[PDB]
Amino acid sequence: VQRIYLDNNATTRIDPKVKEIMDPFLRDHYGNPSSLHQFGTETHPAIAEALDKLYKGINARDIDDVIITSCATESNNWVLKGVYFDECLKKGKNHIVTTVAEHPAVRSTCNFLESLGVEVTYLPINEHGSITAEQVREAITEKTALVSVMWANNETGLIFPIEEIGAICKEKGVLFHTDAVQAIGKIPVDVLKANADFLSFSAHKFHGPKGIGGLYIRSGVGLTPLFHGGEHMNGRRSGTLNVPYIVGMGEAMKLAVEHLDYEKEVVGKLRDKLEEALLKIPDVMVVGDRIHRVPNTTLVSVRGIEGEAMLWDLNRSNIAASTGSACHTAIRLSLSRFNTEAEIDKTIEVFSQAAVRLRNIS
């Protein structure tokens, strides 16, 4: 059997290099980095290297923090809850502005916040499949504590106008947070250019392990711990370091950065090829703008014949993809560095055949 994996915005294969780098931390270097003795100390250099890699990946400065978390969900929670504590309860700034596009980790948190009496305004998506970059301005009520926009959408692949929201944030004096989970390894990420106070990411979206993430926190910006215990991560996030995962994550980030051109030029090309092939079939059209999208994602909708059925069919032939809400759900196909032209060709063939079968059934 040969399976084809097209669900990369859902999770990704760990890179063999990442695995290799992690291995000795599962085996002999198992000491607690907080310990004083040779085990803990032994862990330091590797950890430092990992951190450096992470920093380079998002163009963070020495003065900034990139705090290791257990996942981007965690990061999101920390950002929102932290801002509620600091800026909402204690400074009366009882408004947050986000988008409707945001990952449930944000949206759900926001809902919870609202249930405590926070006002949250969720910017409606337009026909272009974006936020105007101005709706924010139109909604910064000064009582706004935080603005939170995802860098790229997980369903559509669509890139939002970060950088221009950063300006609208700097001008307005409001805290800016970008969940960047689906940006890493896909497009350049620059926290400086973004004027982000907070950035989220998760390793498993760029060939690291599940179960680890980052929150970038800008110098001098404060955020009340979500994990109190104050022993690790400069007091900001307590809990014994996940050494293996840290190392792996660092490596993954490095690899992601290295493959940016490749992602653009080759993965993107593959995606385009797939998309074009698909569109030469009855009443199947891409959902959203096709220009401001990360290179790896296509979301496509088949006339009548629903998405779930299609997905099931694909699975039956060993091809893995996901749904994406579009308004009938659509079909989300998300490539990686590891797909090949051959695979794409096969997918196209299989997709067409599946469509025809479903068509026949209809």
Closest to a second copy by CB, 69 vs 301, is 69
The response to whether 128 counts as a known ligand-binding position is no
With respect to a second copy, which residue has the nearer C-beta, 169 or 256? Answer: 256
Which partner from the list a second copy, Cl ion, none does 209 bind, CB cut-off 5 to 8 Å by kind? Answer: a second copy
Residue 1 vs residues 5, 317, 318: alpha-carbon distances, Å: 13, 10, 8
Contact positions toward a second copy, by CB under 8 A?
A: 3, 5, 7, 10-14, 19, 22, 26-27, 30-32, 34-39, 69-74, 76-77, 103-105, 108-109, 111-112, 202, 204, 209-212, 224-231, 238-245, 308, 311-312, 314-315, 318, 320-323
| Pair 199, 210: CB distance under 8 Å | no
Taking alpha carbons only, the member of 120, 117, 111, 108 closest to residue 73 is 108
Residue 110 annotated to the active site: no
Is 240 annotated to bind ligand? Answer: yes
Side-chain-side CA neighbours of residue 62 (13 Å)? 0
Nearer to a second copy, 43 or 195 (CB): 43
The interface partner of residue 353, options being Cl ion, a second copy, none and the CB cut-off 5 to 8 Å by kind, is none
Q: DSSP string covering 223-267, please?
A: ---SS---SSTTTTS-S---HHHHHHHHHHHHHHHHTHHHIIIII
Q: What is the 3-state secondary structure of 29-53?
A: CCCCCCCCCHHHHHCHHHHHHHHHH
From the list a second copy, Cl ion, none, pick the one residue 71 interacts with, judged by a Cβ distance below 5 to 8 Å according to partner type: a second copy
Which residues make up the interface to Cl ion (CB under 5 A)? 81, 226
Ligand-binding annotation for 322, yes or no, is no
Our measurement of the distance from residue 250's CA atom to the centroid of its chain's CA atoms, rounded to an integer in Å, reads: 16
* DSSP class of 85: I
Nearer to a second copy, 37 or 280 (CB): 37
Annotated active-site positions, please? Answer: 327
Known binding-site residues for pyridoxal 5'-phosphate equal 72-73, 154, 182, 202-204, 240
Known binding-site residues equal 72-73, 154, 182, 202-204, 240, 327
